[PDB]
Design a protein around this ligand. Structure first.
Ligand SMILES: [Br-]
Ligand SMILES: [Br-]
Ligand SMILES: [Br-]
Ligand SMILES: [Br-]
Ligand SMILES: [Br-]
Ligand SMILES: [Br-]
Ligand SMILES: [Br-]
Ligand SMILES: [Br-]
Ligand SMILES: [Br-]
Ligand SMILES: [Br-]
Ligand SMILES: [Br-]
Ligand SMILES: [Cl-]
Ligand SMILES: [Cl-]
Ligand SMILES: [Cl-]
Ligand SMILES: [Cl-]
Length: 248
């Protein structure tokens, strides 16, 4: 309860901790982490926000309208208690197509949405890029056309670049999908602490997944592809929050 921001519509914004339930655990999260900067929205899970480049929360109340922070620096963080699926296999199930294709359908053989049909690329930023295998699309498009009378649609929005990081035993520990350079340009540029946008350009986006197996949490970040180089500091900032705020 140390720091104080504006008072708007009667509410004085502070960084005082707020009790947040995720499964059976209670996390005492400084209010200014929260998307609302007051209390969790109704529903399961919570949304936090951190700010590029130092992965610190928005100053208390600075996101409240009229905002005083720079919205282009925000990185929204959806944290969920995982109780509908196994947390230990979540990242492998997101990177395949068992859920979005029917058992034994032509679409279950789609190489685009299965990690085990994509092609590993050379490491960069500690990530293994995984690319679409156009040779497998030829075979797929044949059985798809012969069975529907139509060649399959190559919609660039659903042909994202994928990135994988792994633990020593091979388990997936990070999974990131980004708009391809064919779908979207970066739409912003960075030098130092500040990000200024390119108008008429839609910023390329990534979604970035990881889990906390011990707390049974999934974490989903949505951020501009221009921020991708700092993916590890983002994980580090969120895992520190999770570690520090959990009520022992
Ligand atoms: Br919230
Ligand atoms: Br609501
Ligand atoms: Br302020
Ligand atoms: Br779930
Ligand atoms: Br390599
Ligand atoms: Br997709
Ligand atoms: Br895995
Ligand atoms: Br993990
Ligand atoms: Br922007
Ligand atoms: Br998405
Ligand atoms: Br904290
Ligand atoms: Cl509280
Ligand atoms: Cl919950
Ligand atoms: Cl590899
Ligand atoms: Cl490995």
């Amino acid at each position: 309860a140390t720091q104080t921001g504006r008072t708007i519509n009667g509410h004085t914004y502070t960084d005082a901790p707020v009790d947040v339930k995720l499964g059976p655990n209670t996390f005492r999260i400084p209010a200014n982490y929260l998307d609302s900067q007051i209390a969790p929205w109704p529903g399961e899970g919570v949304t936090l926000v951190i700010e590029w480049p130092d992965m610190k929360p928005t100053a208390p109340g600075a996101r409240a309208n009229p905002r005083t922070n720079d919205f282009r620096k925000e990185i929204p963080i959806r944290i969920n208690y995982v109780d509908r699926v196994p947390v230990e296999t979540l990242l492998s199930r997101l990177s395949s197509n068992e859920a979005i294709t029917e058992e034994g359908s032509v679409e279950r053989g789609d190489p685009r949405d299965r990690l085990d049909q994509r092609v590993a690329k050379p490491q960069t930023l500690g990530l293994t890029p995984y690319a679409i295998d156009e040779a497998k699309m030829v075979v797929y498009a044949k059985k798809y056309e012969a069975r529907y009378g139509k060649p399959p649609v190559r919609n660039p929005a659903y042909e994202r670049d994928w990135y994988i990081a792994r633990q020593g035993d091979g388990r997936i520990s990070s999974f990131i999908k980004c708009d391809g350079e064919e779908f979207r340009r970066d739409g912003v540029r960075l030098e130092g602490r500040e990000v200024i946008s390119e108008p008429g350009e839609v910023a390329a986006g990534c979604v970035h997944y990881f889990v906390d197996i011990d707390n049974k949490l999934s974490v989903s970040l949505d951020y501009k592809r221009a921020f991708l180089k700092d993916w590890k500091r983002m994980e580090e900032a969120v895992r520190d929050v999770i570690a520090r705020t959990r009520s022992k």
